[PDB]
Amino acid sequence: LAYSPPFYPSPWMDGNGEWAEAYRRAVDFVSQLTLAEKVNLTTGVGWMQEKCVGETGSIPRLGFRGLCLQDSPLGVRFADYVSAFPAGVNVAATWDKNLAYLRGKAMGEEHRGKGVDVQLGPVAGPLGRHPDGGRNWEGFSPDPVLTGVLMAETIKGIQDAGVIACAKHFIGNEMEHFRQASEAVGYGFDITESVSSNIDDKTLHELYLWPFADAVRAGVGSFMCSYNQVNNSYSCSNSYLLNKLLKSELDFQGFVVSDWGAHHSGVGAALAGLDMSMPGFWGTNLTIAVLNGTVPEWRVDDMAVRIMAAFYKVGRDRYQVPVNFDSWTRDEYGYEHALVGQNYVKVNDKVDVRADHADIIRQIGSASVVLLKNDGGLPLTGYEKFTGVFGEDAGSNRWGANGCSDRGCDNGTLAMGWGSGTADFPYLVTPEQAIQNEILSKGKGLVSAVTDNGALDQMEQVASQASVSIVFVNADSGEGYICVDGNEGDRKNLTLWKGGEEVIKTVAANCNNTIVVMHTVGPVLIDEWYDNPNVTAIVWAGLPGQESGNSLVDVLYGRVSPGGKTPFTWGKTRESYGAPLLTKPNNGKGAPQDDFTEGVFIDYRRFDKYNETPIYEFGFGLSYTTFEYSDIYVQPLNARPYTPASGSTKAAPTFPSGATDGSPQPILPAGGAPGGNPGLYDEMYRVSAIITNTGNVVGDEVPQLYVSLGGPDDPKVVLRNFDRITLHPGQQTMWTTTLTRRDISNWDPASQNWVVTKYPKTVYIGSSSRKLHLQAPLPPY
Amino acid sequence: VSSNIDDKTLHELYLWPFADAVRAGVGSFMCSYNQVNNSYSCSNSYLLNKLLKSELDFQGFVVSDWGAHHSGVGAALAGLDMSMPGFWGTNLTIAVLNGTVPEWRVDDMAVRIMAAFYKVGRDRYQVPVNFDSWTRDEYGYEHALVGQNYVKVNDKVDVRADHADIIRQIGSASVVLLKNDGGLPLTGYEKFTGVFGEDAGSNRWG
Amino acid sequence: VSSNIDDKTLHELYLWPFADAVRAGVGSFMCSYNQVNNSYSCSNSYLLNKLLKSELDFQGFVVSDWGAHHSGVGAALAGLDMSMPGFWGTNLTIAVLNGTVPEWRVDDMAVRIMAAFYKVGRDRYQVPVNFDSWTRDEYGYEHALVGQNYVKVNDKVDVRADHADIIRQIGSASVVLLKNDGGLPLTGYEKFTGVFGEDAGSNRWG
Numbered sequence A: 001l002a003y004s005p006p007f008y009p010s011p012w013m014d015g016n017g018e019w020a021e022a023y024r025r026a027v028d029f030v031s032q033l034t035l036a037e038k039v040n041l042t043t044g045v046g047w048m049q050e051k052c053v054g055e056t057g058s059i060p061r062l063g064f065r066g067l068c069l070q071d072s073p074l075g076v077r078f079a080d081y082v083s084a085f086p087a088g089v090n091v092a093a094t095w096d097k098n099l100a101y102l103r104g105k106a107m108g109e110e111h112r113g114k115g116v117d118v119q120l121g122p123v124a125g126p127l128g129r130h131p132d133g134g135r136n137w138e139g140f141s142p143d144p145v146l147t148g149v150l151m152a153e154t155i156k157g158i159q160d161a162g163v164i165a166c167a168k169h170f171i172g173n174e175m176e177h178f179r180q181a182s183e184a185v186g187y188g189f190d191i192t193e194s195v196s197s198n199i200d201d202k203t204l205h206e207l208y209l210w211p212f213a214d215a216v217r218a219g220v221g222s223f224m225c226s227y228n229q230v231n232n233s234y235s236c237s238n239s240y241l242l243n244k245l246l247k248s249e250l251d252f253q254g255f256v257v258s259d260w261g262a263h264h265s266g267v268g269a270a271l272a273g274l275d276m277s278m279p280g281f282w283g284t285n286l287t288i289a290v291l292n293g294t295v296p297e298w299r300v301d302d303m304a305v306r307i308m309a310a311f312y313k314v315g316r317d318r319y320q321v322p323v324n325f326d327s328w329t330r331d332e333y334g335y336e337h338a339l340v341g342q343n344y345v346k347v348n349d350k351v352d353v354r355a356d357h358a359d360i361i362r363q364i365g366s367a368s369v370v371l372l373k374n375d376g377g378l379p380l381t382g383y384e385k386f387t388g389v390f391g392e393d394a395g396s397n398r399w400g401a402n403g404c405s406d407r408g409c410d411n412g413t414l415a416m417g418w419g420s421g422t423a424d425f426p427y428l429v430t431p432e433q434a435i436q437n438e439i440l441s442k443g444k445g446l447v448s449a450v451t452d453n454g455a456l457d458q459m460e461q462v463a464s465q466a467s468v469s470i471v472f473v474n475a476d477s478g479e480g481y482i483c484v485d486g487n488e489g490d491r492k493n494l495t496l497w498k499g500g501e502e503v504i505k506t507v508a509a510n511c512n513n514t515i516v517v518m519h520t521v522g523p524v525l526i527d528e529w530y531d532n533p534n535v536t537a538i539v540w541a542g543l544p545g546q547e548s549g550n551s552l553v554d555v556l557y558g559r560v561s562p563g564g565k566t567p568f569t570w571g572k573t574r575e576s577y578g579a580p581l582l583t584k585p586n587n588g589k590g591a592p593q594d595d596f597t598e599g600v601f602i603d604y605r606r607f608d609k610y611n612e613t614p615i616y617e618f619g620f621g622l623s624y625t626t627f628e629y630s631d632i633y634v635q636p637l638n639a640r641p642y643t644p645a646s647g648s649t650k651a652a653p654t655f656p657s658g659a660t661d662g663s664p665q666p667i668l669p670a671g672g673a674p675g676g677n678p679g680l681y682d683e684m685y686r687v688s689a690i691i692t693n694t695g696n697v698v699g700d701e702v703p704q705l706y707v708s709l710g711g712p713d714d715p716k717v718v719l720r721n722f723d724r725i726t727l728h729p730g731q732q733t734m735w736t737t738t739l740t741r742r743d744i745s746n747w748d749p750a751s752q753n754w755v756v757t758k759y760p761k762t763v764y765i766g767s768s769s770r771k772l773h774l775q776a777p778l779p780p781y
Numbered sequence B, C: 001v002s003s004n005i006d007d008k009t010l011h012e013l014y015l016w017p018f019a020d021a022v023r024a025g026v027g028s029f030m031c032s033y034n035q036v037n038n039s040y041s042c043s044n045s046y047l048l049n050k051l052l053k054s055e056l057d058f059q060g061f062v063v064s065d066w067g068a069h070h071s072g073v074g075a076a077l078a079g080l081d082m083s084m085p086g087f088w089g090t091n092l093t094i095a096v097l098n099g100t101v102p103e104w105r106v107d108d109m110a111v112r113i114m115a116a117f118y119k120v121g122r123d124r125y126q127v128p129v130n131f132d133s134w135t136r137d138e139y140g141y142e143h144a145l146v147g148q149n150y151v152k153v154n155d156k157v158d159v160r161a162d163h164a165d166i167i168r169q170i171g172s173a174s175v176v177l178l179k180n181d182g183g184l185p186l187t188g189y190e191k192f193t194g195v196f197g198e199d200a201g202s203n204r205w206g
């Protein structure tokens, strides 16, 4: 069995740099607390025992209420009068830092307005190892850079709005199967322990840990340790994971909270780096363990100060208002137990926090549409004589937009996946609705919507008369506690749901101007229809939230040129992706073993390595205009040589070998600041190229910079930077970025540091991972 | 919920069959999930200590319904003998050590359980448990001091014997004829018999 | 549709089992809905006059499939003897009187029908039609020359005799064993028999 070595003591905060003010105030607060009060900050109150998805204990003596921790990564869960934003995978498809930031801000606003202290998101774990992983859509992209950049922007948005963000799930939670034994037992599996994600040190550093480093460096206030084990130690009591990787190497200054009921070694978890136990025994035992010296006072002091530093860092002292909604009822009033008898109290204020957030949701919707094919199908005008709309995915959830709890169904248009990663829709504009409005406000031609996937006779009938047929298909997935159609969180296949492929084929056989819109959580196998000559256009539109239909028509009818690029690969087969899902336990009754044997070769890296050609490669998308790439130029910057970090920490302040050691500790060679040794972010090269709009309409291009690191075990290419750029017809721009030292380095397990190998490196600039228009060597120095 | 039942109603209605059960020599009682007069059955001293164990002089053991709420160690004082399904074991041990629960009580709990055991002759009739509630698999894994043991979990012991006979007979004996204006009995020589209703047919899922 | 079949194929394949039918003494033929070489079977003189009634020398009567299209009176000349289900009556009468259908043709049509009748002994075995195709009701109305009569329309005559035996036997003999790798036969002493598939179960509508 793969093994996780111990690493103690649990590092205490430095409170240097951007964390100094927050640390100073956290220290002044914690100094005033009893042991009991400090412990309260670390202890969840109990599942459904208060208002939020999780709450800490309070400190009434100082008029300090317990923190409110609330889902989700795309909105405020279990709340009324809130917005439903596009999923993270949609954000990834925008390739747009600014939009990710603004989505974060708006979500932050909504959480703040409700009294939430901690938004439980965004997500960089799962990263996206498996194309059929159930919760990938909550995150961004299998690519660590795309994910890391947009993760960071999202965090800055949330925290700038005055709410603590929570990077989750740390780490290796790449599938839902066997994530939690009780859950697996519910599915008829006999195991007593969560699966172990077995990840080698190199793979961790270069893939899964990378976006979490970005999260740390972006100033995220909290992390959530995952349900699964990593090398046969539960994330939430994995000393190597938390004490070494997170709190030493990445020098995380904030607090680590457990996933809800994520198994840990109680008091041992605290020594291994856990700061907060959710949802709530730990309170009492922590108090006792401090009193008898099993847990040193500086540990509990550090737990409390991390929590309070996060609080002050985002300005919770300024922005906090009373929690004005209840997670567990929509009723205005409810009975509560009193010291004597009961009271009848206000539990929901129905505070409307939506503001103008429908605009940014429509915009991100449009920006996340990816044009995969267009042989003269798009844009439409709205003056078409006869428009046919086809597929259940065009239509309404007949149970109401919030008719499936936690969105645990696939009724009507798919705008959101299922599980904790959800929010209630204030409304839902369907494609059927938006398309009919478009026509009836313009040319007022014929339009008919056949939204029963079994009604094939009607689809032929209508398609054969149509000037254009717009076909809607979907594929759904979500968190493991919900099973839909035999998908136990994870997808059981990469097929279109509800006979979608049949809908496409039926319509395309009858209409030679067929448009296909895919609302999918991830890739599906399209080999059998994408190349159908009668299919004149194909878009992926993902999970667009409340404005789905409107955001779509803005693109389809040409008000917005599509500018998204696919943030994952569309392969010919499931086998193309490699990394099959473990769906049968392989360690008897013990922890199943998901070995990450493919290393860094997931998604496009795998395709490139094995020379499999994608149908649509990572980073690919079309426009209503054309772009041209020219004149790459590489400038060496002659950065200072890399210095491994060195020296000591301070002694642990007060306000398993080494676990009670509060003496000064040696700094790790790759640590020394939040996000890693600062020398890693030194700029080594400046790289430029010219992008020109050679077409006839204004449009966005997403230029992409890839690096070949040049070793035999390196990917042929890895994404390193990108931007989204609006260009008028004929307009040119010089796209200039820099490559950091980290950008051109490899992880060396022996030296425990990032190294620039002697293999020659090549830089590429292009429009996708396969359309590498420009290249130049990176000259060593 | 609290079932609020006066003393007379209890004695003349709900308790009566339970008295019959005691007197028939029943080895165990299971205390219910609900409360009676705002005390949970499994920690209701009036119910268990007074009515069951004094007035009805029950000699066997009281087990809780599965997760039937009680005041932990105080349940034992109130007449509970066995906690199902389970985290009170170490708490009962402690309560005995610190004197909150007398020795004679834990002793009486143990001896009630064993008394029931010997009363029906478990000592003569016990055989290993040869089936598993949670799987039909023949084998399965169990954790060990080190690694795992692969063990037999179902022996598929056929215990049905001839009990289909009594099940058929009781089926027939439990038919109640509520109306008959020349409808029954039938002969089997009817020219055309219609059978109507899903309640006549098979469970299509097995 | 026109089934286009060459002379050799007809003779060596499709016609062959019909020759056997003729030779078995079959009393009637039914001409088909389709065309053969672009002439409707029921008005196809090559098919009825030549192949069936000359070469195969069929002595019985040809009846049309129900509403099988034909050239009216012209069909009679092409070898049709009976038009089902039924304008042809009076047109045929007319055609005889005005000379378009020879007296000998109609005479032959009638004698073919009556020949079939006597060949199987309908004169001996005919009984009243004692059921109705269109209702299961015992009685019904029929129009009289004045008013209506209420008449028996179904007698529910049970003709099944012992025919369940032959049906069971032919059932068994028509079973084809395509594969057997130690699977069959069974004994009825299997510990656990699973039956699977809707094709095992009842038509829930009766």
Ligand SMILES: OC[C@H]1NC[C@H](O)[C@@H](O)[C@@H]1O
Pocket (backbone or CB within 6 Å): A053, A071, A120, A168, A259, A260, A420
């Ligand atoms: O609902 C709270 C918590 N439950 C479990 C999920 O894994 C996590 O993402 C979520 O934040």
Ligand SMILES: OC[C@H]1NC[C@H](O)[C@@H](O)[C@@H]1O
Pocket (backbone or CB within 6 Å): B065, B066
């Ligand atoms: O299944 C165990 C237990 N569950 C609860 C029921 O109330 C009880 O009758 C049953 O014996």
Ligand SMILES: OC[C@H]1NC[C@H](O)[C@@H](O)[C@@H]1O
Pocket (backbone or CB within 6 Å): C065, C066
């Ligand atoms: O039911 C009358 C008649 N209808 C048409 C069929 O083809 C034929 O076989 C049948 O005898």
Ligand SMILES: [Mg+2]
Pocket (backbone or CB within 6 Å): A048, A049, A050, A051, A328
């Ligand atoms: Mg409540």
Ligand SMILES: [Mg+2]
Pocket (backbone or CB within 6 Å): A011, A012, A013, A014, A247, A248, A251, A649
């Ligand atoms: Mg540090």
Ligand SMILES: [Mg+2]
Pocket (backbone or CB within 6 Å): B053, B054, B057
């Ligand atoms: Mg007594």
Ligand SMILES: [Mg+2]
Pocket (backbone or CB within 6 Å): C053, C054, C057
């Ligand atoms: Mg002749």
